[PDB]
């Protein structure tokens, strides 16, 4: 059972952010959901939840800027912020109470991901994918896009897992990102290799060979 | 305000027995005091519920204690898949008077292990376009300090490249790390070998690997 956060990752100051978590699998649990945050490098944040009987509860801070709801027909929890600034650049994570409780955060037993928020006057770009080609080494590069994240980047469509190091993102000095994901694989190996990068935010979906 | 947390960050030995502290002002409400344990890139994960009560699956080197306004998570036989941020969280009331703890990082040491060393030159296609990408990359070593060094034609670089390193592998407590050269298409071409040298404890003396361009 899986909580699909979905968001539009890059958004301007002022904008109203618009979050979904959607219960992509049937439970006959009675269960509450809540949204938490988690600023670069920082703890976690409380915003709000909702209960097994829709109570909706929300933090101090967010009362006033925050509004909880869920849809039932489509099993779709929504979190909506309003004029976002700079400072509301974090991951947004919804959670699981299984006990039902909306105002509680010693039980959250199943998460979602995240979902990356970049709030920021810099315009969305999508990125180049370079395979750097060759026990052996090779992966693929990742280069100039804006925002950081959602950023995907699988092997062989989830084939490959084992050594494999997707590198944290780093800021170039032009002001976009760049990473780059590796995996060490045996050195005669000849094997099709896929890295599948997906950058959400500029709607890009490549597949890339790494050939020798 | 965030429940406290002490300490900040601590390290220990693989087997090692580490214990994080969390403490709240108000009084936990029937029990509820729970710990979550994030990796790098990661959702928090629930560890123990209800102050002592281990999730399903949960190796039993954790344990939760305490009572009132102070907790103790304690992990008996520290592994290297316990490198992570911990959080404990608490309930005062049904209300909304409920918050997390600051986080406690924790590091394992281990003993010194050497990187293994890979160069990539930049792909055809990004020749295509004007930039040049040279890539080093330094496998599974320990401890995190270790400088990469970029050359080209002998000339050593600086300020044309960027790194950034893996979080403590969840196997082997290592590191990994990747050194990018950025450089023009023009002033690519007008060189030779591109190489990259490496110090790191673990070995007894600088290893370099290079190419030559074509």
């Known amino acids: 059972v899986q909580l699909v956060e979905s968001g539009p990752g890059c958004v301007k100051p002022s904008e109203t952010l618009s979050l979904t978590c959607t219960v992509s699998?049937?439970?006959?649990?009675?269960?509450?959901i809540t949204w938490i945050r988690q600023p670069p490098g920082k703890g976690l944040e409380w915003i709000g939840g909702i209960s097994s009987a829709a109570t909706t509860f929300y933090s101090s801070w967010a009362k006033s800027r925050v509004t909880i709801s869920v849809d039932t027909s489509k099993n779709q929890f929504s979190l909506k912020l309003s004029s976002v600034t700079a400072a509301d650049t974090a991951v947004y994570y919804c959670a699981r109470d299984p006990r039902g409780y909306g105002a509680a955060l010693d039980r959250l037993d199943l998460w979602g991901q995240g979902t990356c928020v970049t709030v920021s006057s810099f315009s969305t770009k999508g990125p180049s994918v370079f395979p750097l080609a060759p026990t052996a080494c090779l992966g693929c590069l990742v280069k100039d896009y804006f925002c950081e994240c959602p950023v995907t980047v699988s092997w062989n469509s989830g084939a490959l897992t084992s050594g494999v190091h997707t590198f944290p993102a780093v800021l170039q000095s032009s002001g976009l990102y760049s990473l780059s994901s590796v995996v060490t694989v045996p050195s005669s190996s000849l094997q099709t290799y896929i890295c599948n990068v997906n950058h959400k935010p500029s709607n890009t979906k490549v597949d890339k060979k790494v050939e020798p | 305000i965030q429940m406290t947390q002490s300490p900040s960050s601590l390290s220990a030995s693989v087997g090692d027995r580490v214990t994080i502290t969390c403490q709240s002002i108000?009084?936990?409400?029937?029990?509820?005091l729970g710990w979550y344990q994030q990796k790098c890139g990661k959702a928090p994960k629930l560890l123990i519920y209800?102050?002592?009560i281990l999730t399903s699956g949960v190796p039993s080197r954790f344990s939760g204690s305490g009572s009132g306004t102070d907790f103790t998570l304690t992990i008996s036989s520290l592994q290297c898949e316990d490198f992570a941020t911990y959080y404990c969280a608490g309930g005062f009331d049904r209300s909304g008077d409920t918050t997390f703890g600051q986080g406690t990082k924790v590091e394992i040491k281990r003993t010194v292990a050497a990187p293994s060393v890979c160069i990539f030159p930049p792909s055809d296609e990004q020749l295509k376009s004007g930039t040049a990408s040279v890539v080093c990359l330094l496998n599974n070593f320990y401890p995190r300090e270790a400088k990469v060094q970029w050359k080209v034609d002998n000339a050593l670089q600086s300020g044309n490249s960027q790194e950034s390193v893996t979080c403590q592998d969840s196997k082997d407590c290592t590191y990994s790390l990747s050194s990018t050269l950025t450089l023009s298409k023009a002033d690519y071409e007008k060189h030779k070998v591109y190489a990259c040298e490496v110090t790191h404890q673990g070995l007894s003396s600088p290893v370099t690997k290079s190419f030559n361009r074509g």
């Open positions: 108000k009084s936990v409400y029937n029990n509820r």
């Open positions: 209800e102050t002592s």
């Open positions: 699998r049937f439970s006959l649990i009675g269960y509450a």
